[PDB]
Amino acid sequence: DAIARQGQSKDKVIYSKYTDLVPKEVMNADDPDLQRPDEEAIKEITEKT
Amino acid sequence: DEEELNDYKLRKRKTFEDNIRKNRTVISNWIKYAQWEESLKEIQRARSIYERALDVDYRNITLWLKYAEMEMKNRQVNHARNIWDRAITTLPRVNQFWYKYTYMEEMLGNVAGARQVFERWMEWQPEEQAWHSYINFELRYKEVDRARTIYERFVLVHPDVKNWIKYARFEEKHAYFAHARKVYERAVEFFGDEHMDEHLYVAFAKFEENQKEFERVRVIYKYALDRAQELFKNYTIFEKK
Amino acid sequence: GVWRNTEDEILKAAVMKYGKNQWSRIASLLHRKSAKQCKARWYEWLDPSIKKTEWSREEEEKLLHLAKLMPTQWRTIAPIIGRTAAQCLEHYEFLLDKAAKAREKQLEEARRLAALQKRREKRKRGVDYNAEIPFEKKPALGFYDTSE
Amino acid sequence: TYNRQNWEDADFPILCQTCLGENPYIRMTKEKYGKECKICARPFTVFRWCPGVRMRFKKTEVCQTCSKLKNVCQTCLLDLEYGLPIQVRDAGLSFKDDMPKSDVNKEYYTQNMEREISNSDGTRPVGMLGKATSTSDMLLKLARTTPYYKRNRPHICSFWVKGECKRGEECPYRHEKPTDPDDPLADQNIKDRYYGINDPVA
Amino acid sequence: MPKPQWHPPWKLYRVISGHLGWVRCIAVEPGNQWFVTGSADRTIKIWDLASGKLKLSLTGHISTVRGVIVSTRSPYLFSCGEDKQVKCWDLEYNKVIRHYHGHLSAVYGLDLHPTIDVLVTCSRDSTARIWDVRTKASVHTLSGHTNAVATVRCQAAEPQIITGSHDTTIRLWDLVAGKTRVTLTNHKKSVRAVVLHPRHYTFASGSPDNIKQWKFPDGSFIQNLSGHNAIINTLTVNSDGVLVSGADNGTMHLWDWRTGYNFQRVHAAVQPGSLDSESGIFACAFDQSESRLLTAEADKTIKVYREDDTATEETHPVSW
Ligand SMILES: [Zn+2]
Ligand SMILES: [Zn+2]
Ligand SMILES: [Zn+2]
């Protein structure tokens, strides 16, 4: 991955492995992983931006 | 004569830069400029031209191929290794980069550790020619347990009746008859157990006829009971023998 | 309105050079001829798709039938039977009668000779490619290399 | 059609100890986009001050990107660590870095290095400082230790050279004889001093 | 592998005609009273949602109108076209009141921030531009795409700006710095449509190769909705979980969002006098009630689809 990023810092995400290409398993609809970051954090991001 | 050569080189470079500035996306102007710079023995100038062309459009196969070939035609071996590492890490799905990297690091490089580099390609699940060339490369490096793991991962990743037949032939040619019998038993148990392919059973019957004719007759009877015309021909061959 | 064979050969060469839709370009070559005259001469006589053969029985039967149906409309009748209007009209009349680089290189050599004569006796905000690399892009470094 | 050199606007100039003077309290003037850079020709934040009592009102000459690139002073054009010309330091360490001379290539290279520095931490003289780890070969023998204030001396009065300085002792310029014009030490191109090419002091 | 939930199929129930060009974009007013279409007729038509009657027609654009959006928190109508101009119409007087200007080529689409009142436009000069609404000042120029940016999507959560372009790339941008954050290169062909889920913090991208479902904010790959191998021009998602993919060849596919299971293939007919090559979905949108689907077909028609309530689960069983 140090071949992939040259001057870019480690905060920027780079997709390079084969495991980035395989699909994840289909999972539950009611789950906090696939959820919005909720109204107070959206409002804080909105006011900061 | 030196001033005339400098004026000729300046005129050629001015026309090449004007052809680049007129149409940036046309890569043949970049290739002609880089080959003219390499023909005048200016390696770093042609390297800068190739790096500019890759910055313009990195998705072209021929730019990477020509720049790696220009690095390999000179003595810059480590530069060519860096070029191939960048070409692998940007475009993994182009098998020609992998093939030319392995021919460069196997013939000219002569490094066995490039096989570990080759295992990076085994992360990507390539086409079956990569597995066949790696089987023949491990045979050329005289390794049979490594090639057994290679063919086991080939059967697990790309399962086919021809793949299982090649595994049976490789286990027979490597003087491992018990491993060949276990591989044939696993292929009978998994590959086409309910699909009734009637081709791995013929290979198992041929391996048993190489081993013991009673087990070959039993395998031919089981293939005739499970089932085509090839199964009837194998049953007639087992009855005639 | 006469047409010499010399003018016919020149017209054939002009059609084979300039295509079909140009006619004033063709009529520039022919003296005392117009573009409309050239187009009519091509489409009436000199076109190679004109059937310069004899009439068959089927062609004569269709010609007599269509002349019975649509009287004296030969521009309509003629594309049905494949001949032209004049040929089918003449054949119908006959059937009724029967029934009855170096310069730039030389300039560069002269400029080099003048430059050597001035050397023997600004830069216009340009980029000198012979002095250094024009846009130096260094190759990316990684995992190898000991220079040269 | 939308590429041009960005204007370098920043505070806190990078100067030597000698050109900064000796007083701990310095009164300082800043223009936002006052003059152009003497090398890369971009506009930059111009700092001007008097280093002492009878000095010259020295001001910054090159931009902050060029001075951060070659690790030199903005006025003296000498190295911050040693007080030497950059030709001497390049002969000591490495002379394979170089820079383009044509103006379009110089502006393009300066824009690329400015974008590289702005994408970096902000204050680092690229990998050349990584080539500057090996030191004290011979440069520490002739390096100055005392602040040479005689280069902050004011200029020679040209009216006094012709003998017509009517100000007399009121004239802040120097009423003394100049150096020899036949001496080849007196040429001193600024771009030659920055690029380290045929500098007679070096 | 869970069984997908049964969705009732949809049927065409009215066809609206009257445009003299290709209807390129459809937007719905947030109070669900009317909707609005932009065309290649250089006109913008406000249509009644219930009756289907033509309420208003506005001229002023000089080329083909490519994108129309209605502001949810202001009485403004934003229209972008192929004439390199963005127009903010005040609906209060039905007149153009602001001109956002500065794109070098044709603007292919636009989107509004739901909270900040800032505008983002994507154009054919390989750039997106972020404009303050009131001052008409281009506060950012997002660049980095090497080809024309076909579509743009905007959201309140991080990342704010999503761009899909013709060089097979999707860029997840950062709003405050104007720099890209995530680059997704998984598509083989041009990414012509991106759509964001209203509640699951995921999104999907459309290309002629495949449809790809991802996961915010890192853009990690989730699912590969395969099939429907045509030039997909548009993508919309129901709040109930129905994803509609519309293509340039006229075929429409309907999917469950979760399992990625195609449950309906709808290929509508054309206008009475019309070629078979003039069949193509340029845009489609649900209403605010999530019960009417409105498509802008390439035969100068607006086709409106309704749910079929008579169908049940055993009448239309879910395959596998
Ligand atoms: Zn100094
Ligand atoms: Zn400068
Ligand atoms: Zn004086």
For chain C, what is the HEC assignment? CCCCHHHHHHHHHHHHHHCCCCCHHHHCCCCCCCHHHHHHHHHHHHCCCCCCCCCCHHHHHHHHHHHHHCCCCHHHHHHHHCCCHHHHHHHHHHHHHHHCCHHHHHHHHHHHHHHHHHHHCCCCCCCCCCCCCCCCCCCCCCCCCCCC
Instruction: Point out the ligand nearest to the CA of residue D19.
Output: 1
Q: How remote is the C-alpha of D189 from its chain's centroid?
A: 12
Q: Are C108 and B11 in contact (CB under 8 A)?
A: yes
Q: Which residues of D touch C138 (CB under 8 A)?
A: none
Report which secondary-structure segment, H or E, holds D70.
helix D64-70
Chain A CB contacts of E130 under 8 Å are none
Domain boundaries, given as residue ranges, for chain B = 1-241
- Strand order of the β-sheet with E10-17 is E10-17, E301-307, E292-297, E281-286
Those residues whose C-beta lies under 8 Å from the C-beta of residue E11, and which sit 6 or more positions away, are: E305, E306, E308
Residues 6+ apart with CB under 8 A from E287: E28, E32, E35, E49, E294
D118/D123 Cα distance (integer angstroms): 9
D102/C126 touch (CB, cutoff 8 Å), yes or no: yes
Q: How far is E95 from E59, CA to CA, in rounded Å? A: 10
Q: What is the DSSP string of B209-233?
A: HHH-HHHHHHHHHHHHHH--HHHHH
Mark whether C42 and C55 lie in a shared domain: no
Contact assignment for B82 to C134 by CB distance below 8 Å:
no
Any CB–CB contact under 8 A between B74 and chain C?
A: no
In angstroms, the CA C36 to CA B113 distance is: 82
Closest by CA to E109, choosing from E44, E154, E155, is E154
Name residue, tokens 């449509």: E193
Instruction: Give E211's strand partners.
Output: E206, E225
Distance CA C105, CA C110 (A): 9
Whole-number Cα distances in Å, E317 to A26, C20, D68, E1, E5: 21, 64, 71, 17, 10
CA distances from E54 to E20, E36, E37, E57, E296 (A): 14, 10, 11, 8, 15
Contact E106, E121 (CB under 8 A): no
Residues C85 and C70 sit within 8 Å (Cβ to Cβ): no
Check if the beta carbon of residue E242 is closer than 8 Å to that of residue E256: yes
Q: What residues of chain A lie within 8 A of the CB of C143, using their CB?
A: 3
Rounded-to-integer distance, Cα E249 and Cα E267, Å: 9
E with C: 3 or more CB pairs under 8 Å?
A: no
Residue type, E108: Y
A42 class by beta-carbon count within 10 Å (0-12 exposed, 13-18 middle, 19+ buried) = middle
- Tell me the one-letter amino acid at B155: V
Question: Measured on CA atoms in the order C44, C49, C55, C59, is the torsion positive or negative?
Answer: negative
Cβ–Cβ under 8 Å, residues D79 and D72 = yes
CB B152 within 8 A of CB B163: no
Query: Counting ligands in written order, which one lies closest to the CA of residue D66?
Result: 2
Let me know: does E136 contact E119? Beta carbons within 8 Å.
no
Residues C33 and C55 placed together within one structural domain of the fold: no
- E133 closest CA partner among E189, E88, E75: E88
Nearest to D58 by CA among D89, D13, D25, D88: D13
Gap between the Cα atoms of E150 and E110, Å rounded: 10
In terms of Cα–Cα distance, which of C52, C54, C74, C49 is closest to C63? C74
Q: What residues contact residue D48 under an 8 Å CB cut-off, 6+ apart?
A: D29, D30, D31, D57, D58, D59, D60
Cβ neighbourhood burial of E34 (10 Å; 0-12, 13-18, 19+): middle
Residue tagged 């005339």 (tokens): B4
Peptide bond into E159 cis (omega under 30): yes
Q: How far apart are CA E113 and CA D33, in angstroms?
A: 36
Report the alpha-carbon distance of residue C46 to residue C39 in Å, rounded: 10
* H/E element, D64: helix D64-70
Structure-token match 């990316």, residue found? C140
How many C-beta atoms lie closer than 10 Å to residue B77's C-beta? Answer: 16
Q: Which of B154, B168, B87, B165 is nearest to B122 (CA)?
A: B154
Alpha helices, H only, chain B = 2-22, 27-39, 43-56, 61-73, 77-90, 95-103, 114-122, 128-140, 145-157, 161-173, 177-190, 200-211, 213-226, 229-240
The answer to whether residues E222 and A24 touch, using CB atoms and an 8 Å cutoff, is: yes
Strand E292-297 with E281-286, pairing: antiparallel
Sheet holding E138-143, edge to edge: E107-112, E118-123, E127-132, E138-143
Residue whose structure tokens are 């019957």: B205
Contacts of C125 in chain D (CB under 8 A): 103-104
Q: Is D148 on the interface with C (CB under 8 A)?
A: no
List of chain C residues whose C-beta atoms are within 8 Å of the C-beta of residue D109: 136
Strand E149-154: give its sheet, edge to edge.
E149-154, E161-165, E170-173, E180-184
Query: Rounded to an integer, what distance in angstroms lies between the CA atom of residue B170 and that of residue B90?
Result: 35
**What is the residue whose two structure tokens read 């800032």?**
E118
Nearest-by-CA chain D residue for C133: D100
Instruction: Provide, for chain E, the percentages of residues in helix, strand and coil under a 3-state DSSP scheme, each rounded to the nearest 5.
Output: 0, 50, 50
- What count of Cα atoms within 13 Å lies in the side-chain half-sphere of residue A6? 11
Cβ contact B–C (≥3 pairs, < 8 Å): yes
> What would the two tokens of residue D93 be?
């360490």
Q: Please enumerate in sequence order all residues whose Cβ is within 8 A of that of E17, keeping only pairs 6 or more positions apart, or say none.
A: E271, E300, E301, E302
Closest CA to A36 of E256, E202, E235: E202
CA angle D59, D64, D67 (to 5 degrees): 90
Write down which chains contact chain E via at least 3 CB pairs under 8 A. A
User: Which two three-digit tokens encode residue D69?
Assistant: 């690139």
Annotate B34-66 with b (16+ C-beta within 10 A) or e (fewer). Answer: bebbbeeebbebbbbbbbbbbebeeebeebbbb
Dist CA B170 CA B150 (whole Å): 11
Query: How far apart, in Å, are the Cα atoms of D23 and each of D51, D60, E303?
Result: 8, 18, 82
Reading the block at residue B227, the tokens are: 């089932």
**Tokens standing for residue E199:** 């509640």
Contacts of E158 by beta carbon, 8 Å cutoff, 6+ apart: A37, A45, E216, E217
Of B86, B89, B125, the CB nearest to A16: B89
Q: What tokens appear for E112 in the block?
A: 């509004």
Beta strands in chain D (DSSP E): 28-36, 43-49
Taking the Cβ of residue D97 and every Cβ of chain C, the question of whether any pair is shorter than 8 Å is answered with: no
Asked if residues E89 and E76 have their Cβ atoms less than 8 Å apart, the reply is yes
Residue E291 has phi, psi (to 5 degrees) of: -130, -15
**What distances in angstroms separate CA C52 from CA D147, E87, E291, one per listed residue?**
110, 67, 72
Q: Can you give the residue range of the structural domain that contains C95?
A: 51-100
Q: What angle do CA B70, B76, B78 make, to 5 degrees?
A: 115
> Is B11 part of the contact surface with chain C (CB cutoff 8 Å)?
yes
Q: Which residue from E141, E145, E106, E107 is spatially nearest to E126, judged by alpha carbons?
A: E145
Nearest to B235 by CA among B181, D180, B222: B222
The whole-angstrom separation of Cα D165 and Cα B217 is 126
What is the pairing mode between strands E292-297 and E301-307? Answer: antiparallel
C66 in the same domain as C33: no
- Contact in structure between E171 and E154 (CB atoms under 8 Å): no
Q: Report in angstroms the alpha-carbon separations of E57 from C18, E35, E86.
A: 51, 12, 18
CA distance A2 to chain D (A): 16
CA atoms within 13 A on the CB side of B173: 13
Torsion of CA B102, B106, B110, B111, to 10 degrees: 40
| Residue D44 in tokens | 């930059």
Q: Does residue D51 have a cis peptide bond before it, meaning omega lies within 30 degrees of 0?
A: no
Residues of A in contact with E220 (CB under 8 A): 20, 24
Sheet containing strand E211-215, edge to edge, reads E193-196, E202-206, E211-215, E220-225
Conformation bin of residue E251: beta by default, left when phi > 0, alpha when psi is -120 to 50: beta
Cα of D73 vs centre of ligand 2, distance in Å, is 12
* Bridge partners (DSSP) listed for residue E15: E303
Report the distance separating Cα E64 and Cα B40, nearest Å: 53
Provide the token pair at C30: 């022919």
C28 and C64 assigned to the same domain: no
Note whether B51 contacts C: Cβ–Cβ < 8 A. yes
In whole angstroms, give the CA distance from residue D199 to residue D184.
Answer: 10
Q: What's the token pair of residue C147?
A: 């220079």
CB E241 within 8 A of CB E200: no
Q: Which ligand is nearest to the CA of D107?
A: 2
**Residue (of E43, E11, E39) closest to E293 by Cα position:** E11
Please count the helices (runs of H) and the strands (runs of E) in chain E: 0, 28
What Rg, from alpha-carbon coordinates, does chain D have? 19
- Nearest residue in chain A measured CA to CA from D120: A7
CB atoms within 10 A of CB C75: 8
Give the residue from E204, E206, E207 showing the smallest Cα distance to E189.
E207
Kindly determine whether residue C148 and residue B6, on different chains, have CB atoms separated by under 8 Å: no
